[PDB]
Structure formats: C-alpha cells, structure tokens
Amino acid sequence: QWALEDFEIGRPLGKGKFGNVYLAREKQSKFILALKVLFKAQLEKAGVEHQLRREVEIQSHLRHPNILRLYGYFHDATRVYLILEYAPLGTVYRELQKLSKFDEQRTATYITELANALSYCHSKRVIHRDIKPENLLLGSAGELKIADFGWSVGTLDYLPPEMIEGEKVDLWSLGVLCYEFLVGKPPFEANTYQETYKRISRVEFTFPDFVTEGARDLISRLLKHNPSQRPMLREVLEHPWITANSS
Ligand SMILES: CCc1ccc(/N=C2\S/C(=C\c3ccncc3)C(=O)N2CCOC)cc1
C-alpha cells in the first residue's frame, strides 16, 4: 500500500535497460531508500513480466545483511516501482575499477560475506545463479550486498560449464569472484562471447604470479568442471586461506 506521491525523488543511483534506480525518501518517516522505476509497456515487449513477479515474491521473503532488502513494491498506470534498501557506498565493480585489484583481506572478507548470504538462502531453499560485481553493492560500513534478480526457488564470464552446455552454480561464482577480486579481471575474459564459452567449458585459465598458494587452492577447487567436486559452502567458509585473511 504505497504511492509515488509518498516519496521524494533524488538523483539517479543507476540506469538500467528497463529504467533507472533513484535515491528516494519516504515523506512521512523520512526513511531514505532506493526506488527502481520499471516501465510496463517496456516490460511486456520483452515478456519478463512473469519472471519479475516471481522474483519479487522470492526477494520479499529475504532478510539478510548481505542481501539488498526489497521493502515492497507498487504500480501506477504506466510504471512499476520497487522499494529498495539504499547502499550508500556504491558497487564493488566501481571499487575494483578505482583500486585495480583487492588485497587478500578484502577479498576473503567479501567471499565470507557472500558465502554467508548464500548459506542463509540455502537454509531457506533459495538458490542463486551467477553473481556479477556490478550487482554487488556496499553498505555504510562497507559491507557487501547482493543486488540482482538472480534468485530462484548476458555476459558469459560468471556462468558455470553445466549451465552453458545444458545447485552448484553458486560455488562456481565464488571461484570467479575470488579470482576477479585478487586479479582485476575474471578468469575467462575473452574478446568474444564464443571464446569465453570455450574457456569456461575447458576451464581454461591461469593465475598471475602474485596469487598465493591458499588462494590458488580455493579458486582451483571452486572452479572444478564437475559440480560434485566443488566444495560445500561450509568448506569455503572454513578454508585456511579464508580464515587466515577474512574479518
Ligand atoms: C529487487 C532487488 C533489486 C532491485 C534492483 C536491482 N538493480 C539495481 S540497484 C541499483 C542501484 C542502488 C544503489 C544504492 N542503493 C540501492 C540500489 C542499480 O544501479 N541496479 C541496476 C540497474 O537496474 C536494472 C537489484 C536488485
């Protein structure tokens, strides 16, 4: 039970294919938040209307410090609105660009924060797909926040081989993200989609010389072609390299 008139709209926080996300404030409470404006006619054309409803229904039942909270949703004649948590410190992707690459502490901490979020979901029967650093936002204390529509009950980089050839997708992603964090680009980056495909399929990639043993060990184990070879989330959180380096 919300209306556009309940909100003061600030500047845009991001510009998507299906409309912008705006910094917004709730007038009565002065609650600061983000508002995603999706256009109905634009949603129908793409036929994503059902996936969106299903996605919103799943998200709304999710409460974890490392998942961007969806407070609710509403619509008018032409638009659909999603009411989101505001993450003041921008995306991890933007942070990577500025720093080139993260150190082991930041990486390990981020992997911990991620594994925790996934663990919470895995205990509620919720599964995630690939996770891109563009969809990872930062809280006021620099805590990481999964912000995407990839929950269930593009670029190939973050997708595992069992999904591009046609569960354990989550764990593949942590491998990709951990590599990307320490290195500065994801392990299968190519100039064409079709090349990336081939790299993922073969698990063809190398480490730079600065990547340490413990990191090589975790990434290598997470990026196994065979899904049943990949470690459990519990194993990831208790990997020596994680425990030595995380917060
Ligand atoms: C339903 C949960 C959800 C909603 C929108 C999402 N996409 C988001 S959120 C966002 C910016 C933001 C900044 C600070 N605080 C909050 C958000 C942003 O830039 N995107 C991608 C553009 O929309 C397709 C991701 C997840």
Pocket (CB within 6 angstroms of ligand 1)? 13-14, 16, 21, 34, 36, 59, 68, 70, 82, 84, 86-87, 137, 147-148
Entry resolution in angstroms? 2.8
103 catalytically annotated: no
Which domain, by its residues, includes 216?
Answer: 91-245
Whether residue 22 sits in one domain with residue 134: no
Are residues 24 and 72 in contact, defined by beta-carbon separation less than 8 angstroms?
no
Annotation-wise, does 157 bind a ligand? Answer: no
Amino acid symbol at 95: E
**Number of domains into which the chain is organized:** 2
| Whole-angstrom distance, CA of residue 174 vs CA of residue 194 | 22
CA distances (Å), 99 to each of 102, 165, 239, 246, in order? 7, 34, 25, 19
Whether residue 224 sits in one domain with residue 165: yes
Whether residue 5 sits in one domain with residue 119: no
Residues 6 or more apart whose CB falls under 8 angstroms from that of 161 comprise 200, 201, 203, 225
Whether residue 132 sits in one domain with residue 18: no
Cα–chain center distance at 119: 14
Whether residue 95 sits in one domain with residue 84: no
Cα–chain center distance at 240: 24
Residue 156, number of CB atoms within 10 A of its CB? 22
Last residue of a domain, one of 90, 106, 131: 90
| Whole-angstrom distance, CA of residue 81 vs CA of residue 84 | 10
- What method was applied to determine this entry? X-ray
- Kindly name the residue from 6, 76, 103, 130 that is annotated as catalytic: 130
Annotation-wise, does 55 bind a ligand? Answer: no
Annotation-wise, does 135 bind a ligand? Answer: yes
Residues 6 or more apart whose CB falls under 8 angstroms from that of 224 comprise 203, 230
Whether residue 184 sits in one domain with residue 69: no
The CATH number of whichever domain residue 6 belongs to comes to 3.30.200.20
